[PDB]
Amino acid sequence: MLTFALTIVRHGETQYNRDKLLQGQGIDTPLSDTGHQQAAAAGRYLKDLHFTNVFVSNLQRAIQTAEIILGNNLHSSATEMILDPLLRERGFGVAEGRPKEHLKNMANAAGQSCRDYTPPGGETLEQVKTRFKMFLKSLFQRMFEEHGSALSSVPSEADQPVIAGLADDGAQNVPVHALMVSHGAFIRISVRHLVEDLQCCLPAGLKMNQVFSPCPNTGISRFIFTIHREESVLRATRIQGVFINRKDHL
Ligand SMILES: [K+]
């Protein structure tokens, strides 16, 4: 009954990103000069889209990116930025602020692979995914409550959106449109949840290696959700991937 677009953007570069140090929930660094530039370029790229809703993590690097994107936007000045701590980066505990290479050493020393390993004080992959699941539940409820004017009884075929390599791909006739600004590990985990764990459609020519790749700073992804209410429970009946980790603006 409600169809809405979700655009997902990773925050712009920090000095930690540049120096390849792990950045989680505890070190609240700002954008570097490079990050400010990347955020402005993403803001210019998305400037002609109306974001009816905006959600950002509580972390400064993400808040700044969201602020720059909205400042550059030509349609969304009345949209409030909602801070949601559920969008924070995966926690890395004692590994945070150490070279990403140190995490690999810790994994090795502990006998597990980089994928199985969670450092002390850190979050496991399932814990991060649970946060995204909670975010989705909150997102659906908020979109549904606010966009009664957009609700429709008309069902469609799971055919492909128009993807022309432009900023509005897949959203040309989708007026309800949320922006989500978050973090690389969180987004990667979230994308895999959407694609693998849920019923999901992916367009012609999109390689799975791309779908599951790490997101660059200000890399942009897009999904279209169709949600239904049954027994007062909201559920996604269709999730359509449009593009993943796009960085044409860079
Ligand atoms: K699936």
Q: Which two tokens stand for residue 77?
A: 């000045």
Rounded to the nearest angstrom, the distance between the alpha carbon of 162 and the centre of ligand 1 is 21
Which residues are tagged catalytic? 11, 89
Helix or strand (DSSP H, E) at 106:
helix 100-110
Rounded to the nearest angstrom, the distance between the alpha carbon of 52 and the centre of ligand 1 is 28
What is the stated resolution of the deposited model, in angstroms? 2.0
Rounded to the nearest angstrom, the distance between the alpha carbon of 195 and the centre of ligand 1 is 5
Q: What is the dihedral of CA 56, 35, 189, 205, to 10 degrees?
A: 110
Rounded to the nearest angstrom, the distance between the alpha carbon of 239 and the centre of ligand 1 is 10
The total number of structural domains in the chain stands at 1
Which method was it determined by?
X-ray
Tokens 């993590």 belong to residue: 57
Q: 12: which residues sit within 8 A by CB, 6+ positions away?
A: 31, 32, 34, 35, 36, 37, 38, 39, 42, 61, 64, 65, 68, 217, 218
Where does residue 159 rank: exposed (0-12), middle (13-18), buried (19+ CB within 10 A)? exposed
Measuring CA to CA, which residue among 235, 195, 240, 207 is closest to residue 222? Answer: 240
Q: Which two tokens stand for residue 67?
A: 């602020």
| Strand boundaries in 19-110, DSSP class E | 53-56, 81-83
Measuring CA to CA, which residue among 232, 227, 71 is closest to residue 151? Answer: 227
Measuring CA to CA, which residue among 88, 42, 60 is closest to residue 183? Answer: 88
Rounded to the nearest angstrom, the distance between the alpha carbon of 20 and the centre of ligand 1 is 32
Domain range enclosing 4: 1-250
Distance from chain centroid for Cα 3 = 18
Q: 101: which residues sit within 8 A by CB, 6+ positions away?
A: 20
Q: How many CA atoms lie within 13 A of 158 on its CB side?
A: 13
Q: What is the CATH number of the domain that holds 110?
A: 3.40.50.1240
